Fold this protein.
Amino acid sequence: MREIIHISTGQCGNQIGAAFWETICGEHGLDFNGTYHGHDDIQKERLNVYFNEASSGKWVPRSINVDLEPGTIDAVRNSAIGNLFRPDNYIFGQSSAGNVWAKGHYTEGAELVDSVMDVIRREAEGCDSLQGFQITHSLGGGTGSGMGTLLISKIREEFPDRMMATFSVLPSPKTSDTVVEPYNATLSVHQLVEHSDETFCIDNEALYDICQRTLKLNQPSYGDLNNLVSSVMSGVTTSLRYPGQLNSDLRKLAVNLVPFPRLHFFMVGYAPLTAIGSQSFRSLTVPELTQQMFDAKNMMAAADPRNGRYLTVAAFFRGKVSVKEVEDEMHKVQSKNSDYFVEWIPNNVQTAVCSVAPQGLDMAATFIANSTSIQELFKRVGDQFSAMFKRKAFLHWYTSEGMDELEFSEAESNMNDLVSEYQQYQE
Amino acid sequence: MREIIHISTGQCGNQIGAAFWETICGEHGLDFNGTYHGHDDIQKERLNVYFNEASSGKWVPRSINVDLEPGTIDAVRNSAIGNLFRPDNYIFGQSSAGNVWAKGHYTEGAELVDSVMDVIRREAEGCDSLQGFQITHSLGGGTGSGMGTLLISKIREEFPDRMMATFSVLPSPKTSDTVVEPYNATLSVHQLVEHSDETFCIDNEALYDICQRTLKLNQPSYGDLNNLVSSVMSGVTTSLRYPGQLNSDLRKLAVNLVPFPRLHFFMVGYAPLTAIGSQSFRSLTVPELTQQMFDAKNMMAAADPRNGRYLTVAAFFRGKVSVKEVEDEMHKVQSKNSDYFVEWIPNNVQTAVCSVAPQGLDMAATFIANSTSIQELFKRVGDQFSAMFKRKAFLHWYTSEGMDELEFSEAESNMNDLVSEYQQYQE
Amino acid sequence: MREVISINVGQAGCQIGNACWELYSLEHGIKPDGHLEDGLSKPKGGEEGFSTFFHETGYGKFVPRAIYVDLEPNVIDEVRNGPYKDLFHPEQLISGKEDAANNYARGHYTVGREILGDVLDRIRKLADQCDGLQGFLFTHSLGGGTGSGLGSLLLEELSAEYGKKSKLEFAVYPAPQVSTSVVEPYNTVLTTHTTLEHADCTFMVDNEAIYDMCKRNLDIPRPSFANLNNLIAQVVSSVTASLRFDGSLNVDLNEFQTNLVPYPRIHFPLVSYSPVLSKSKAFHESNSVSEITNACFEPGNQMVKCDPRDGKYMATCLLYRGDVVTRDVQRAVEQVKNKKTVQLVDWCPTGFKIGICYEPPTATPNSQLATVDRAVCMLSNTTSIAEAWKRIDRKFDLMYAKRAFVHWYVGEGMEEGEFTEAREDLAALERDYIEVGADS
């Protein structure tokens, strides 16, 4: 019960999935021409999770990438490693979803998705130990928010016993690429909360801030950000695919980290956040990774942690680590950071140990937690709606297809309910 | 309880701290490429005071250098040994404090100092046996006097159990680089007396006099003066970092040398004061060092010792010394110099023994004492104020930001109180 | 009632202890690492003693039973990086890591007593390890605040836990001419009251007198602290003369407090060791015990900067090692009485405790003391140090006029009442010193 099928959709989702693919093929070791490079055994049975054995000792991915623009796959098969992708994995159409929610999946997005569901079924009986479903998409993007939720609907319909993992990128409330980006984001979360079991809060501006703070990056490139998020995504499952003291699974995240399926929003933090030029001057140890974990400028929600409080926090450690260091540092943080932990657990902690070291580093970890700071982003988006959308400007583009104000009022009620849940559970 | 964090600020403070760094790395032995040269054990556990173990057996300093002009660090990393400095230690901004007190820390100096306080905290939990705080700055300098006192305020706020050591350079009452240098000096000592536990009186003109008397130096260079003051600064802590008959600590200075926290001004004397061309003609012994200690032209206050009287004197000896020589010479000085000692201790003496010999010499010592000659400098500065500043010329530059005459009157009352304390304790 | 536990506090006390265990290894034939090398006698353990100071390991090793307590880790590191590592148990070396004073500012207060619990537990476990308990040996410096404070705290703690064992304290007193640090008189007198209320027998040693005899008797131009440690090491190890070696008339530890101390009153005897000569003066002197006793009566050999002949007589003990004759020593003491020495009291009225030991006197190779066939250790509770405490108290009055230190002393939690109580206690002690000889 380990195999994972990686679903990719949206403009940003394709890049994130591709970068995740190069990170995977580099962390376990596999050249693009079909040459075995695992060392020695544990890197062979665990690659069945993402790849399947083809003829002549060839390994090919089991991943359905879907997008209405076919220009991204050209920059995948001829670019860096995507040559393993079988031609049937390319499900693309013409020409775009319109960068909106009314045309994303309501009328035209429901045509080829039947074939998508059929190929998902055929991969399902082609798979033996299907475990989870990984989706990468954009919350405000037309394609990702458009058919992503409807794919979630089908994957719930056909698999009532399989949980769903979503990693949508949340647009910042201060950057507006288009006037209807938060509109599409909220029209997507209208069904995301009713169809998903857990999700991660990803903000590009937080990535820019961490690049200009620690990385000192001069050129704003989405490739480095994809590399970082893909390293985080690999790290959250290294515990499952590499045994340790306590292996962690997505269902274990649902049981422990999630307080109830209604509240499933998480902020992501990664460590170590070091760049070239500081590698010969730091000692990479568990305590340093810990102060980098609870540092207020290291998560990518991105909100303020010490102005609110946490509800439950988790640690997913990687590499050769002793049991005493991590628990001693956890005693230290529980002694000094006791005020911001909830007074009913009372020890907000979930630990997981990974054996192999991260690629390009020695010791690393990921941060998953629940705080009361996401309701601030929700009320910011709601206030943006209550300000801009009361004029009913450019709103006919969606009501032309049969949209009613009842759906928007229900979405506002949903975000009010989410805020109230974030206040139960007071800040 | 030994580790020391060296804080550096101001134009002169950066040079003094750098020179102290080369003197330290030469006295214990450490090449700039990361090569171990200690001999053998005692030079290894004692370097944890200033350096921390990095990866691959590398030692890096734990010192926060701050200055509003970024040109000094270029003459540090590319010049003589400063390459060990980690890039995060460089906290610099733009562009200057204005060489004044109104803009030093009152309005614009309080912006980046929050980040300075945060990095001090992170070094605090990064440190295990934090002992004291060393600061080098200029009393009349705009930057050093500007945010130096406010850094002292924070270091008192966050560490109520840690004493503070200050080594500000006191400008002479006869040299005026700028018309407001004593003004900034007094605006700094307005809070220095209320926030510091001990301080040293350093005058550059005394250094010039001792260079033209014994050194016969032809070129006036600040580097030699920095070397001398850094040798003195190393000598005052050789007792702590090298065991002897009586190890001395800064808290021991506070207990013994300081009569009460209000009076904490000390004059500094060093021995031997010998130059090239006299090394083959003198016998370097304890008695000769003693006559060089009480010599009226060897301290750097610089005032007249035999026209006033001492309140308490201390000796900090270094090198292979027998217990009998030092005590016999102390009997001699107490017999011949009994008139100038206070009649209530009555034996003004504090002794400390160091094991290792000073670098570049065989036997050396430092002089720390309390006399009634500092009130003369204070009244000289006060008379300079009462003469120049009654015209209110160029005084609007500070009152433009919200300065009141109440602060200046309170500073005058403070210096009157210091004089009265220096007369209790009569001269 | 078999074993004696020794505790050293302060750097000076640790150096003295190092020297004294070096000697103990020297005469009893233990190599600087132990086991063995090899065993000598017959009697050195077996038969008992040892064990008296060295634990008898079942494997055949010899382990000193001492506890090194100090807040300065440098001394513990110096002990652990030398040959002393094979003699002291790792748990007995209590290494401190907190340095805020040296040390009486915080030593005699709440800062020290959260560590004293572990020390008491360790010493209780060590006492349970051995069969019986006879007395305790203390080696601390009253100059260094660590010694004063921690030693006094241990004094009240172990007087409370048992209250029935002999308490021997070898306290190093500050030089009465000059003091190395100003706070040493406080470190001494603020614990003199605890010493008065919680001690059975205290020995006074002065570094100035040792340096004087090193300059004069040893002809050493630059005496070292190691020489002082070795000299007082022989002084301690000759007490402690018949407890480890056979003798015609052995002296018991309880006998000291039975004869020298007949009251609930003054119990602070002086000590003296003689002959004191160098390796070059051993080719001209073969004196008898009379001149050795005369040298003991000399002020320079009394380890106190005072005149012992100007005081009044008190019960004294004479311990003899090597080849001695009882008729000779009786003749010598009768001559001393004939010379009209210190005024004899009417309460004893004349008591000369004589101790004879078979073992020859021993000397340290690190010291310049020549081996002699006969030596005298003299113990007397003479009232001649009264002017010494009087001089210390005059210093106290002159530096208490301004009080000079009450700022910090009150700021940590004390007040001038304690200083006044110590002052009046010292005055009462001096008055008792005068009266005990004035009654006769």
User: Anything to note?
Assistant: The two ends of chain A are 38 Å apart (CA to CA). Chain A touches chain B through nine residues (CB under 8 Å). DSSP finds 15 helices and 14 strands in chain A. Chain A has three domains: 1-259, 260-373, 374-427.
